[PDB]
């Protein structure tokens, strides 16, 4: 009669962070009881971070929506109770469909916007195709409030507009500018699995204004002043050249063998023969020759002997050297050149695409888009998609140079400003999913204002979050991890994997899957009302890869969307890229497809840069800036000035020191905010889980069941603070209240506080009084709306000055 072990394990994927780990769910008596890493995973195996267990308080969250709703208070605002009442799916989508069709009749489909927060790889239909067919260019992702500045170095130096995996198992030196990979970043499960072991063969240095978990388990913690990371990166490169310890097999060497790099002195470009890099000597002559350890120590306070020793240790470890950048180092108004300066070291020491270094995700045959929709665009749609985007990307002061294109990248946080100012125009109809921009974007009160000015908005969400407060209609989502068909990927351990999301329980409430069932039902409703292009596109183009037939109903369509994109993994023989799977059923049962190991040096000699080299002098960035300048009939120097960078001339294209942007009077606001994530944050989605609070002190220095801001005792004494005091923290743009904690792991002159609390909605555990009073304090109310304009990224670090007081 014993029951231990008699349940079933079913494969899915976690999305508590962009690690996107493959999981198994243990189900008994129809309930999900356990989560573990999927042993079939080649990236991480059964290894997991702690947040996997919090998933069970999300699907079984007692504040989830069980029905569509409409607001009945016609006023919108933080001060206005929406007075939601229940309606049917048919009525909710009827209301949305009517508003969309009215835009098309009025020849203003560009006044529709689709907002995307989290997502899976089946998102193309809801995000792009539905939006363009309606006739709008305003499919707005969250990428620029995430980490687009972190892609600038990799793209403009080695052609990778994307992330890297870090070969920790083979590393001999690990240098982290703000990354804390045993707590956050993009494979917490795998880097936690390996971090302790790696300390036995790698020297590890963590540069962070706070003592992170990773820094506590490192050979050196460098408590950098916020925004000064590039000073250390540049001085390390300088010493490497003076000492002659760049990685010659990758970079090259002087023609006559003798090292001619002497501090402060220019060198003939023609005396050096580069192999797989471009621009080393120009970089030296234009800037790096004067970035001495003494220069760096004066700015940072770091011992120059420590800088020199690090550079020499990296030289001896090459090419098994890897340099990490986090959001904290690069999501700053001038942060593009921190990504470039730190990532340049991965080329200088040969770690890029090398054993022990870092490299991109492996190739897989997963499809990422549904078929082209060109035949389904009518004249109304063709005209609308050409309009300027609501986030103003591509204007002189917003180059947002994703993948080398002026206006190529989203500017998520600025969409609130375009909407608020009706510039370029008014947004009249909005559909949003899996997002909470009032809470997650800097100075989110701007989204309060913007959303209050939108005639009709519908939010696809599990919970009534802060963003939902401003909705006309709520469309409750089936939970991504337990009630949904989806597909994701992950990279690490030298491989890329593709994993399934599948329902593991009977659907709890009257919800629908955001990315499949809802666009399908909406397309059907639009067709009933005379606009059938989305419906025709769906049932003629998204058909089963085996039978060629369209879906018979909602539930079938949810699975079909995954079958369509994954067919190359299980319908074909994918052996050339990794695993050979025999059937769709085997894919579902195992839950994951694994690639072959990464082929080291694969990209050497064929980077997707202008020169095909690893560019210390980025001709790739020069070409992109030239394009933007020519578009606006100005010089590149005038672009730099308009975007508030210090660089002029050749400095715009090389690693160089930008003084960090700061906002506010330092005498009034004497502390620099050090925003951090909680290691129990599933992005902005675990504040309504009681277990989160019970264990909140696993964040070093923090306090269970509380929201604390951490001060060094020096500053606590200065401002008369004691542990447990209720405090108000104020910046030039806003304030929050929380409690005080004194902790020596905080750099004096800074205050380290986790993002994630401060909800005033979401649920009964996340808020003090639902809809009225927050629990804890909302970090982004402190953070002025600022941008790394070359990337479009929002700034969350470095520029935030605050003051503190009791009560």
């Amino acid at each position: 009669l014993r029951r231990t072990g008699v349940g079933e394990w079913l494969a899915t994927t976690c999305q508590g962070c962009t690690s996107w780990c493959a999981k198994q769910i243990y189900v008994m008596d129809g309930r999900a009881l356990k989560v573990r890493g999927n042993p079939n995973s080649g990236v991480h195996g059964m290894s997991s971070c702690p947040r996997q267990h919090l998933s069970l308080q999300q699907v079984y969250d007692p504040d989830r929506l069980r029905t569509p709703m409409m607001r009945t208070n016609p006023k919108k605002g933080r001060d206005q109770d929406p007075k939601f009442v229940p309606i049917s799916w048919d009525k909710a989508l009827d209301m949305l469909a009517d508003k969309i069709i009215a835009l098309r009749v009025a020849n203003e489909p560009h006044k529709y916007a689709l907002l995307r927060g989290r997502y899976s790889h089946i998102n193309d239909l809801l995000y792009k195709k539905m939006t363009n067919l309606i006739g709008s260019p305003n499919n707005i992702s969250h990428s620029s409030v995430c980490a687009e500045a972190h892609k600038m170095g990799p793209y403009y130096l080695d052609g990778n507009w994307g992330y890297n995996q870090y070969d920790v198992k083979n590393a001999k030196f690990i240098l982290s500018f703000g990354a804390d990979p045993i707590a956050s970043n993009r494979q917490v499960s795998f880097y936690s699995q390996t971090w302790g072991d790696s300390l036995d063969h790698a020297k590890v240095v963590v540069v962070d204004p706070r003592l992170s978990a990773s820094a506590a388990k490192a050979h050196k913690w460098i408590p950098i002043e916020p925004g000064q990371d590039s000073v250390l990166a540049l001085a390390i490169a300088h010493v490497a050249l003076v000492e002659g310890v760049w990685h010659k097999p990758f970079v090259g060497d002087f023609i006559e063998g003798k090292n001619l790099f002497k501090a402060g002195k220019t060198v003939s470009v023609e005396s050096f023969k580069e192999t797989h890099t471009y621009g080393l000597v120009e970089w030296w002559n234009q800037a790096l020759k004067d970035y001495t350890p003494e220069w760096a120590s004066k700015i940072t306070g770091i011992d120059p002997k420590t800088i020199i020793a690090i550079a020499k240790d990296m030289g001896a470890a090459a090419p098994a050297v890897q340099v990490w950048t986090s959001r904290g180092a690069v999501m700053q108004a001038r942060g593009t050149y921190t990504s470039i300066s730190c990532h340049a070291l991965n080329g200088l020491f040969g770690g890029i695409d090398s054993k022990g270094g870092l490299f991109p995700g492996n190739k897989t045959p997963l499809l990422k888009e549904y078929p082209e929709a060109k035949a389904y665009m009518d004249e109304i749609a063709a005209k609308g998609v050409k309009k300027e985007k609501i986030d103003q990307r591509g204007r002189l002061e917003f180059p947002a140079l994703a993948k080398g294109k002026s206006g190529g990248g989203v500017i998520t946080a600025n969409a609130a400003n375009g909407i608020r100012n009706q510039d370029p125009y008014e947004i009249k109809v909005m559909l949003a999913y899996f997002n909470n921009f009032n809470f997650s974007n800097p100075e989110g009160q701007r989204w309060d204002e913007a959303l209050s000015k939108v005639d009709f908005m519908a939010h696809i969400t599990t919970n009534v979050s802060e963003f939902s407060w401003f909705a006309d209609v709520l469309l409750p989502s089936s939970h991504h991890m337990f009630e949904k068909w989806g597909v994701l990927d992950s990279i690490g351990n030298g491989v890329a994997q593709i994993s399934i999301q599948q329902p593991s329980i009977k659907r709890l409430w009257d919800t629908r899957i955001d990315e499949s069932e809802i666009p399908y039902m909406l397309a059907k409703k639009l067709a009933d009302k005379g606009f059938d292009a989305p419906w025709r596109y769906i049932n003629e183009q998204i058909v089963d890869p085996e039978t060629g037939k369209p879906a018979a109903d909602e539930a079938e369509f949810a699975k079909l969307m995954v079958r369509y994109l994954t067919a190359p993994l299980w319908k074909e023989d994918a052996s050339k890229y990794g695993d050979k799977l025999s059937s769709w059923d085997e894919f579902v049962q195992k839950g994951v497809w694994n690639s072959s190991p990464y082929k080291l040096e694969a990209r050497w000699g064929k980077f997707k840069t202008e020169t095909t080299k690893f560019e210390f002098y980025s001709k790739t960035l020069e070409k992109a800036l030239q394009s933007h300048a020519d578009k606006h009939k100005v010089s590149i120097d005038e672009v730099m000035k308009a975007c508030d960078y210090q660089a002029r001339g050749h400095l715009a294209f090389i690693p160089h020191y930008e003084e960090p942007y700061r906002f506010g009077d330092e005498s009034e606001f004497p502390l620099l905010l050090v925003d951090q994530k909680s290691r129990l944050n599933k992005e902005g989605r675990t504040a309504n889980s009681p277990w989160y609070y019970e264990f909140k002190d696993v964040d070093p220095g923090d306090v269970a069941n509380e929201d604390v801001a951490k001060f060094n005792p020096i500053d606590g004494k200065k401002f008369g603070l004691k542990d447990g005091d209720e405090i108000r923290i104020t910046s030039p743009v806003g304030m929050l209240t929380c409690k005080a904690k004194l902790w020596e792991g905080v750099r004096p002159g800074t205050v380290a506080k986790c993002f994630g609390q401060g909800h005033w909605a979401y649920g009964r555990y996340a808020s003090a009084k639902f809809g009225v009073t927050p629990r804890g304090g909302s970090n982004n109310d402190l953070i002025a709306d600022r941008y790394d304009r070359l990337s479009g990224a929002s700034a969350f670090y470095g520029h935030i000055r605050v003051r503190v007081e009791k009560v």
Binding site: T4, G5, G30, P50, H53, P62, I182, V205, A309
Partner: protein
């Protein structure tokens, strides 16, 4: 037989995953955590040391919790585990105070009372704890693990004590403790300390282990090897 655990502090990342797994496995009330931790910060900036030690019941050789128990409810089994016949617990609380490690908890409240609430944050729109309880068919909390009931109350009554049982119900089936499977670095290893060939027996011969409060004289059987931090360079 004397089962015990070896925890490798260099592998440990101080994440609490073991303690969260214990919650899902054993149905402990909110605020009751059989697995927990002891964290310390030492030093003045910039020379700051942060360390984390995971804790559980040490299933001691000479257990004060067993010795003080007036009814014999707390007792040793044939594996060396300290287990509790919860039905015979009269709630005298002596075990909790006698335990030098503070790992025993008392059910002052009926567990999972928060799930009897039928209030809704959005009326007729969001659900409630009671409504979710009814929908899932669970008795006390939708997260309750029925496996726990194999050898111990799935939900303990008010006025009884409770602590880590070494996942005895999983051991009975040849399976691992929940915290062991939950650890990403495999930092936790269990086995028979009386068997010289067990991995735990070899681990403590290969490394000089640390124990918690060895001066109390209980003969704890959780051993810690290596160190959470590493030697500072430069």
């Amino acid at each position: 037989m004397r089962l015990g655990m070896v925890i490798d502090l260099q592998k440990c990342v101080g994440c609490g995953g073991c303690s969260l797994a214990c919650k899902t496995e054993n149905n402990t009330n909110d605020g009751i955590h059989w697995s927990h931790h002891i964290a310390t910060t030492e030093g003045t900036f910039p020379d700051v040391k942060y360390t984390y030690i995971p804790t559980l019941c040490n299933h001691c050789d000479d257990a004060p919790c067993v010795k003080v128990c007036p009814t014999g409810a707390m007792h040793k089994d044939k594996r060396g585990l300290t287990l509790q016949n919860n039905d015979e617990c009269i709630g005298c609380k002596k075990c909790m105070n006698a335990c030098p490690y503070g790992v025993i908890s008392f059910n002052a409240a009926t567990p999972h009372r928060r799930w009897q609430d039928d209030s809704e944050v959005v009326a007729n729109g969001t659900v409630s704890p009671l409504m979710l309880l009814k929908r899932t068919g669970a008795t006390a909390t939708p997260n309750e693990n029925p496996e726990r009931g194999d050898t111990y109350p799935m939900i303990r009554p008010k006025r009884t004590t409770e602590k880590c049982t070494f996942c005895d119900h999983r051991l009975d089936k040849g399976l691992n403790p929940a915290c062991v499977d939950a650890c990403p670095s495999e930092a936790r290893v269990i086995g028979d300390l009386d068997d010289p060939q067990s991995k735990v027996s070899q681990l403590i011969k290969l490394h000089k282990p640390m124990q918690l409060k060895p001066e109390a004289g209980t003969g704890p059987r959780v051993f810690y090897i290596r160190s959470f931090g590493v030697k500072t360079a430069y």
